[PDB]
């Protein structure tokens, strides 16, 4: 099946998912001189005080922290959005080296990792219906650079031991996503898609301008994960990032 190796990598996805070559594929390079300041764009509204995390699972191409989205407990509104988007899960993309790992790039600069906070439009009723709509999801993208430790990230770092191989899951309650946000909510936004199959073009991307920094040792633990299931030959979960896709006349707007 699809993965990130030379034989099942991003360059191959189009065979099973032709939308891979679509008009609004993600990620993209953010050209900062070409992005347009849009003054009509409202400030992002992140209300995560009532977030309920449930669990963490190694799905074979990352590890997701899942939240209870049966009520409007953790939501995103404002910015370029219309309505309420409920937080469903967050996951990262990282590299084998600190010089790569993010999906989105800024003026072609790659970061060590990229965090994606996935949200779905509540007028569609469920995540599965939302992925079939043009304004179905909203993904908050946050870049990670290696520097000082991120306190709020350590609880995640500590449980990875437990979900080492594909298919493993662990209880992961009372985790507050607020500890993963930078100070500034300035962002860039554009219409795009999921970055892993099915690559559905249902995403409004909100990429934060300010990176969060994490320590070399925190990123090191992400690289100890496996793409393989237990009792299989070990394959380090590294470089689970899709390269930049053509912008194709979409316009990137800036809130600043």
**Region for residue 122 given its phi and psi (left: phi exceeds 0; alpha: psi -120 to 50; beta: otherwise):** alpha
Q: State which residue, 104 or 116, has the beta carbon closest to Zn ion.
A: 116
* Token output for 181: 């946000």
Q: Candidates 12-20, 113-121, 148-156, 167-175 — which segment interacts with Zn ion by CB under 5 A?
A: 113-121
- How far apart are CB 111 and Zn ion at their closest, in Å? 13
- How far apart are CB 4 and Zn ion at their closest, in Å? 12
181: number of Cβ within 10 Å? 18
Rounded CA-CA distance 22/14 in Å is: 10
Q: Supply angle C-alpha 118, 251, 197, rounded to 5.
A: 40
204 annotated ligand binder: no
Rg of the chain (C-alpha set): 17
122 annotated ligand binder: no
Is the Cβ–Cβ distance between 103 and 110 less than 8 Å?
A: no
Q: Candidates 111-119, 183-191, 209-217, 220-228 — which segment interacts with Zn ion by CB under 5 A?
A: 111-119
- How far apart are CB 231 and Zn ion at their closest, in Å? 27
Cβ contacts of 157 within 8 Å, gap of 6 or more? 218, 221, 222
Q: Which helix (H) or strand (E) segment is 182 a member of?
A: none
196 annotated ligand binder: yes
189 annotated ligand binder: no
Under the binding rule (CB under 5 A), the answer on residue 104 touching Zn ion is: no
Q: Candidates 72-80, 112-120, 156-164, 174-182 — which segment interacts with Zn ion by CB under 5 A?
A: 112-120
Q: State which residue, 86 or 116, has the beta carbon closest to Zn ion.
A: 116
List b or e across 156-167, with b for residues whose CB sees 16 or more CB atoms inside 10 angstroms.
bbebbeebbbbe
Q: State which residue, 86 or 91, has the beta carbon closest to Zn ion.
A: 91
Is the Cβ–Cβ distance between 77 and 219 less than 8 Å?
A: no
- Residues in contact with Zn ion, total (CB under 5 A)? 1
Q: State which residue, 116 or 119, has the beta carbon closest to Zn ion.
A: 116
195 annotated ligand binder: yes
- State yes or no: is 61 an active-site residue: yes
* Token output for 148: 């000082």
Residue at shortest CB range from Zn ion:
116
**Minimal CA–CA distance to 183: which of 139, 138, 216, 142?**
142
Under the binding rule (CB under 5 A), the answer on residue 116 touching Zn ion is: yes
Under the binding rule (CB under 5 A), the answer on residue 86 touching Zn ion is: no
Rounded CA-CA distance 102/130 in Å is: 25
Q: Candidates 43-51, 65-73, 116-124, 167-175 — which segment interacts with Zn ion by CB under 5 A?
A: 116-124
Q: Among 14, 61, 104, 119, which one carries the catalytic annotation?
A: 61
Binding-site residue ranges for Zn(2+): 91, 93, 116
Which residues contact Zn ion by CB under 5 A?
116
Instruction: Give me the active site residues, please.
Output: 61
């Amino acid at each position: 099946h699809w993965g990130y190796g030379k034989h099942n990598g991003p360059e191959h996805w189009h065979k099973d998912f032709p939308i891979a070559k679509g008009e609004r594929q993600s990620p993209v390079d953010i050209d900062t001189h070409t992005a347009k300041y849009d003054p009509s764009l409202k400030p992002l509204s992140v209300s995560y005080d009532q977030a309920t995390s449930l669990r963490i699972l190694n799905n074979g191409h990352a590890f997701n922290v899942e939240f209870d989205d049966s009520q409007d407990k953790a939501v995103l509104k404002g910015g370029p959005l219309d309505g309420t988007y409920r937080l469903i899960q967050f996951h990262f993309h990282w590299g084998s080296l600190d010089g790569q790992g993010s999906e989105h790039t800024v003026d072609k600069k790659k970061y060590a990792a990229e965090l994606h906070l996935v949200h779905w439009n509540t007028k569609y009723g469920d995540f599965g219906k939302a992925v079939q709509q043009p304004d179905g999801l909203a993904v908050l993208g946050i870049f990670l650079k290696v520097g000082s430790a991120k306190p709020g990230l350590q609880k995640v770092v500590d449980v990875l031991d437990s979900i080492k191989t594909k298919g493993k899951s662990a209880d992961f309650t009372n985790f507050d996503p607020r500890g993963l946000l930078p100070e500034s909510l300035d962002y860039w936004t554009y219409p795009g898609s999921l970055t892993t199959p099915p690559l559905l073009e249902c995403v409004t991307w909100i990429v934060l301008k300010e990176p969060i920094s994490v320590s070399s040792e925190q990123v090191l633990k992400f690289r100890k994960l496996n793409f393989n299931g237990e009792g299989e030959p070990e394959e380090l979960m590294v470089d689970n990032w899709r390269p930049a896709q053509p912008l194709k006349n979409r316009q990137i707007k800036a809130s600043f």
